[PDB]
Amino acid sequence: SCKVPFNECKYGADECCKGYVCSKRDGWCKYHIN
């Protein structure tokens, strides 16, 4: 019930796959830590 990290991401949206973080600047799902 989630989308790939390569795609976009909504600030706060937990829809993304657990384990990844959502960049506030880039506005996408990534693995790197903020």
UniProtKB/Swiss-Prot annotation:
Keywords: Disulfide bond, Ion channel impairing toxin, Knottin, Secreted, Toxin. It is found in: Secreted. Disulfide bonds join 2-17, 9-22, 16-29. The keyword Transferase does not apply. InterPro entries: Huwentoxin-1. Expressed by the venom gland. GO terms for cellular component: extracellular region. One of its GO terms (molecular function) is toxin activity. Its main location: secreted. SUPFAM superfamilies: omega toxin-like. It holds the Pfam family Toxin_12. The presence of a 'disulfide through disulfide knot' structurally defines this protein as a knottin. Probable ion channel inhibitor. Belongs to the neurotoxin 10 (Hwtx-1) family. 50 (Jztz-F7) subfamily. This is Jingzhaotoxin F7-10.36.
